[PDB]
Design a protein around this nucleic acid. Structure first.
Lengths: 88, 272, 119, 73, 101
RNA sequence: AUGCGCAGAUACCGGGAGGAACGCCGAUGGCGAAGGCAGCCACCUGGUCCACCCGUGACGCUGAGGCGCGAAAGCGUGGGGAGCAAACCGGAUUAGAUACCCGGGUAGUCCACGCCCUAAACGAUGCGCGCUAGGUCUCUGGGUCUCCUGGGGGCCGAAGCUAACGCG
């Protein structure tokens, strides 16, 4: 489940600069990761509509933030796109 | 090696409502098996309607375990035969030889199970009643020891263990009744393998039924020259009679039949 | 007769008929009485009155066997379970200890309209 | 609230984090092994809650009647 | 792997070599799953406040330990297995809360 | 009445089976977009409250449309029915009684996967923010915790709002 450690490690791989204790980068890393192992679970289950739901809202959130990502700058952004994989 | 029930062809003209089933072992049976004559005609006089055939394999299956009462066996795997209401497992006995046996609740290829003098009450092994953990399930079960697996609850998921008394344990049998068998006798552990089958749907009758092998039945079939009942007209007769000089369909058959009182009670009925 | 000085006295009661019975020390019984045992019918049999009476009987018989000492078993409640139990201590014939059961449910089977009106 | 018995002061420093507390636990049993209430443990929401939970754990595996033939009545 | 306390009660009418074979089964099983003790305890045989196992007493074993989280369920089943396991109970390893201080 | 019992019941004792439910605790109490959600245990999970002020850098509020979500009833196949139980059958009724009562018993009620979205769907009151006495109680996070503070629930409650309640 939620492995804090490795977590921070990637918050790291991403946060271009070691001083990103909360940045678009991370909103990204995080919502992503979560979204994914979470969802995978969703699959082998089929009925937890409540949490499915939340997950929903969440994914929204993340994507939208990215929205802004583009808004100001999608450049570095597309790089992100890249690094990650999502939206292809 | 289980099997799909539901697959149904679709609108391939009136071939409508045709239910498929597919055991996955799909292998063609093995070494131990002859074939049956073309009975329907028999003792050379001829008898009982329907009857027709359609292709030809024909079985030999194990009905008796006390004959190795122990050599673990591992599911050779699944498969079946042009007979039986609920597939089989060709099983492998650790000693080399194998045997076509039941096919209780969805067990598992390679699974080890066996039976005899104390078998683990795990659906799959079999045991002398007595090892009956009262409240459990089996089938195949046989009263009068040695008289082989007597009461082969076909796809008959039905041997419900219901208490004991004397040298006989009580059982709830398909039918909706409770008989008794002296404990030393035996039961295949667990339950059957098929039922949905029982629900299977088949297309253009002629086609299906016949394929089944069976042709027909046609009552008070006009010209009641015989056909017990009336005919030579529309109207359904009255008397209240059936084919070959019959008693309708609401009368006994049993008797002293020392058989009867001897065990079982519940008397013959259900109520779904 | 079996005779065993002490046993149990079961007092169980409805609210239009009640019942009592003599049981050995372990659990079987020998004799009893009740609402309609008391030359009674319909209601009435549900009177602390009858209660008293059948109690009575349970008693005379009670002595009638090698017993009289007893623990009281409580089952449900009777419309006059008291006049009943009091008739009990009354004939004495021994008025020992008392057990509490009237074995509660725990929620597992909706009743009949009667106590369904009890949402 | 009614006061002539009470129990919050029967035992001091008690770890609710248990089950094998035959004794202390017992200290809320009353007769038909009920669960002697706020009405007696005078133990905050936090309390009736967790304390309860273990009460539970306790009947659970066992060793405590979670009700019982009452002798007296 | 996390740690939970293994509280489990096993038949009373036991004995010697039996205590042996099934408790050890306990063992190697545990390990096979991912168990490995931290607190090897138990308080011996004891009675209860309600005749379970058709008995008024039995044997109770408690060992708290490390294991592969989820496996819990699994071994658990593996345990109840052995008939006699009158009660198979595992709990997440916490322990703090001083009430009345 | 009734229906069930001397072919012994109704009560008491012991044992068997199974379905459902889940007492006290447990609350005028809690979590949830809503619906609604509870014996404990464990697996995986989501909303969400407080404090350091550490990160980013306004990316945010709204939501026609759609998209997923959910009472109970009922349908679909495959399980299952201990009890309860429209329907049905009785018995009691009045003048009538198809219903209010007592005696019965199906479907359904329950599980899986699929399907209906249904509404006094309620606080009959859309959501998002910020401005205007206090008093009281209760649960919950932080503290110099006679209390204070963030959050959360009922209650009293100036101004004020309304045709009037009553909101507050």
């Amino acid at each position: 489940p939620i492995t804090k450690e490795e977590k921070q490690k990637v918050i790291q791989e991403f946060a271009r600069f070691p001083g990103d204790t909360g940045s678009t980068e991370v909103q990204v890393a995080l919502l992503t990761l979560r979204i994914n192992r979470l969802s995978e679970h969703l699959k082998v289950h089929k009925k937890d509509h409540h949490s499915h739901r939340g997950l929903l809202m969440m994914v929204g959130q993340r994507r939208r933030l990215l929205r802004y990502l583009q808004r100001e700058d999608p450049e570095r952004y597309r790089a992100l796109i890249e690094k990650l994989g999502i939206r292809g | 090696k289980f099997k799909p029930y539901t697959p149904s062809r679709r609108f391939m003209t009136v071939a409508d409502f045709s239910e498929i089933t597919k055991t996955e072992p799909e292998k063609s049976l093995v070494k131990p098996l002859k074939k049956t004559g073309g009975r329907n005609n028999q003792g050379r006089i001829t008898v009982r309607f329907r009857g027709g055939g359609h292709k030809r394999l024909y079985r030999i299956i194990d009905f008796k375990r006390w004959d190795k009462v122990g050599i673990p066996a591992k599911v050779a795997a699944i498969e079946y035969d042009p007979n039986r209401s609920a597939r089989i497992a060709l099983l492998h006995y650790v000693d080399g030889e194998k045997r076509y046996i039941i096919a209780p609740d969805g067990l598992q290829v390679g699974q080890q199970v066996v039976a005899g003098p104390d078998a683990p009450i795990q659906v799959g092994n079999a045991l002398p009643l007595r090892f009956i953990p009262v409240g459990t399930v089996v089938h195949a079960v046989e009263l009068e020891p040695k008289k082989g697996a007597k009461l082969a609850r076909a796809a008959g998921t039905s041997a419900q263990i219901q208490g004991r008394e004397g040298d006989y344990v009580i059982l709830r049998l398909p039918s909706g009744e409770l008989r008794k068998v002296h404990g030393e006798c035996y039961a295949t552990v667990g339950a059957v393998g098929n039922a949905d089958h029982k629900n299977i749907v088949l297309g253009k009758a002629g086609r299906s039924r016949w394929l089944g092998r069976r042709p027909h039945v046609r009552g008070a079939a006009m010209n009641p020259v015989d056909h017990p009942h009336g005919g030579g007209e529309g109207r359904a007769p009255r008397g209240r009679p059936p084919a070959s000089p019959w008693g309708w369909q609401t009368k006994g058959l049993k008797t002293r039949k020392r058989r009867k009182p001897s065990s079982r009670f519940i008397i013959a009925r259900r109520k779904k | 007769k079996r005779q065993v000085a002490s046993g149990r006295a079961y007092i169980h009661a409805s609210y239009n008929n009640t019942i009592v019975t003599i049981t050995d020390p372990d659990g079987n019984p020998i004799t009893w009485s009740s609402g309609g045992v008391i030359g009674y019918k319909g209601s009435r049999k549900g009177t602390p009155y009858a209660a008293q009476l059948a109690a009575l009987d349970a008693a005379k018989k009670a002595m009638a066997y090698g017993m009289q000492s007893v623990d009281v078993i409580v089952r449900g409640t009777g419309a006059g379970r008291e006049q009943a139990i009091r008739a009990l201590q009354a004939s004495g014939l021994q008025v020992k200890s008392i057990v509490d059961d009237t074995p509660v449910p725990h929620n597992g089977c909706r009743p009949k309209k009667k106590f369904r009106k009890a949402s | 609230p009614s006061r002539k018995a009470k129990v919050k002061a029967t035992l001091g420093e008690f770890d609710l984090r248990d089950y094998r507390n035959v004794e202390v636990l017992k200290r809320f049993l009353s007769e038909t092994g009920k669960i002697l209430p706020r009405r007696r443990t005078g133990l905050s929401g936090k309390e009736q809650r967790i304390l309860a939970k273990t009460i539970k754990r306790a009947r659970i595996l066992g060793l405590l009647p979670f009700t019982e033939k009452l002798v007296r009545k | 792997m996390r740690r939970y306390e293994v509280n489990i009660v096993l038949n009373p009418n036991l004995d010697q070599s039996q205590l042996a074979l099934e408790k050890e089964i306990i063992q190697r099983a545990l390990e096979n799953y991912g168990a490995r003790v931290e607190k090897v305890e138990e308080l011996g045989l004891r009675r209860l406040a309600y005749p379970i196992a058709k008995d008024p007493q039995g044997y109770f074993l408690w060992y708290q330990v490390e294991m592969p989280e989820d496996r819990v369920n699994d071994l658990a089943r593996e345990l109840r297995i052995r008939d006699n396991v009158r009660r198979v109970m595992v709990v997440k390893s916490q322990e703090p809360f001083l009430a009345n201080a």
